[PDB]
Design a protein around this ligand. Structure first.
Ligand SMILES: CN(C)c1ccc(C(=O)NCCCCCCC(=O)NO)cc1
Ligand SMILES: [Fe+2]
Ligand SMILES: [K+]
Ligand SMILES: [K+]
Length: 357
């Protein structure tokens, strides 16, 4: 049945307000519309998450503090997560949206559900972190757990998905896999290959640390090698996929050197498992590139090939001077030594030998 696309005008208007990615949500939706992909999906209106729904993960003290400062304009609300007005409502909308997508997958409405404005993977139970005020990925996973026995969370953002990993670090019911830049001084600083979870969750966390300038070919080789092993050991019943576009060449994070094609190959690999899959966005600070990326990936999900020329639509001006969908890799060096990538894969392959269902 057709992929669910989480959308309404109020939801987009809401997500547009996020001071770090102004108007990103409209740009993404607008490009998706321009290519007519929305005609081929089921549009579902996201519900706003209630206080008890957000309480499935977040502490009631954190939530009430969030609600309080959200009028005024120890819970990590500092430089990266300032206490702007309306932040509680923005957070409730995004959490509700991810939970709605989870609910669609639980009801069998679809096999794939999309919330491009979710994917806030740094937030902790009692603390905001790295622009993330609520952990919608965790909320979505917890909802899917009503139906599906084992959940795989895959995180392809530039940054380590520490909030999600930490939430599930002690359980064997959710396996977290994150590929990410791992370098001294680079946020959030966790996720070395030797981080594998703790207690009953030992070996149920996988981390692939990567260096600057990774490109599509070697990236997909890593991702495939890891996911094949995970799938065999862990046998997941549903997948939550985080696709932050801050890996994409041109991003001001200036770290990885990926194109949406390399990412999409990772996404196809997962889609061929034919499981319930909840698709989320995340980082992505070159706004037109992020819309190019997620539009392309939406094409992949629907097996359409999309035209090279960006259609005229509202933000057409943002796509100059060349006006094409493809992104060109930058000239930046690839700092990933193939011998190092090999040890990492083998290390993980070792770890996953301990996982038997
Ligand atoms: C010298 N100085 C005052 C600073 C230096 C570095 C940062 C920083 O790391 N900023 C951004 C790191 C967090 C972004 C990660 C969020 C994300 O994209 N998640 O996906 C801040 C201040
Ligand atoms: Fe990121
Ligand atoms: K990641
Ligand atoms: K785990």
């Amino acid at each position: 049945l057709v992929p669910v696309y989480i959308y309404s005008p109020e939801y987009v208007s809401m997500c547009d307000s996020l001071a770090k990615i102004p108007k990103r949500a409209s740009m993404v939706h607008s490009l998706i519309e321009a290519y007519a992909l929305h005609k081929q999906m089921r549009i579902v209106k996201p519900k706003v998450a209630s206080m008890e729904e957000m309480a499935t993960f977040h502490t009631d003290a954190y939530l009430q503090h969030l609600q309080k400062v959200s009028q005024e304009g120890e819970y990590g609300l500092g430089y990266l997560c300032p206490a702007t007005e309306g932040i509680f409502d923005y957070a409730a909308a995004i959490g509700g949206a991810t939970i709605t997508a989870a609910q669609c997958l639980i009801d069998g409405m679809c096999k794939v559900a999309i919330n491009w404005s979710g994917g806030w993977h740094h937030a902790k139970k009692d603390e905001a972190s790295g622009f993330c005020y609520l952990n919608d990925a965790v909320l979505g996973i917890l909802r899917l757990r009503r139906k599906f026995e084992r959940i795989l969370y895959v995180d392809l953002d530039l940054h380590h998905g520490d909030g999600v990993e930490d939430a599930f670090s002690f359980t064997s019911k959710v396996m977290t896999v994150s590929l990410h830049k791992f370098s001294p001084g680079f946020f959030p600083g966790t996720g070395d290959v030797s981080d594998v979870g703790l207690g009953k969750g030992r070996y149920y966390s996988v981390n692939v640390p990567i260096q600057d300038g990774i490109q599509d070919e070697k990236y997909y080789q890593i991702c495939e090698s890891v996911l094949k092993e995970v799938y065999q050991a862990f046998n997941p019943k549903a997948v939550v996929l985080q696709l932050g576009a801050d890996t994409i060449a041109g991003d001001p994070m200036c770290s990885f050197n990926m194109t949406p094609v390399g990412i999409g190959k990772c996404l196809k690999y997962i889609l061929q498992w034919q499981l319930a899959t909840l698709i989320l966005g995340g980082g992505g600070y070159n706004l037109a590139n992020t819309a190019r990326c997620w539009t392309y990936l939406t094409g992949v999900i629907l097996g359409k090939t999309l035209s090279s020329e960006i259609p005229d639509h509202e933000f057409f001006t943002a796509y100059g001077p060349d006006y094409v969908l493809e992104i060109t890799p930058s000239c930046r060096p690839d700092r990933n030594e193939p011998h190092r990538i090999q040890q990492i894969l083998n290390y993980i392959k070792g770890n996953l030998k301990h996982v038997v269902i």
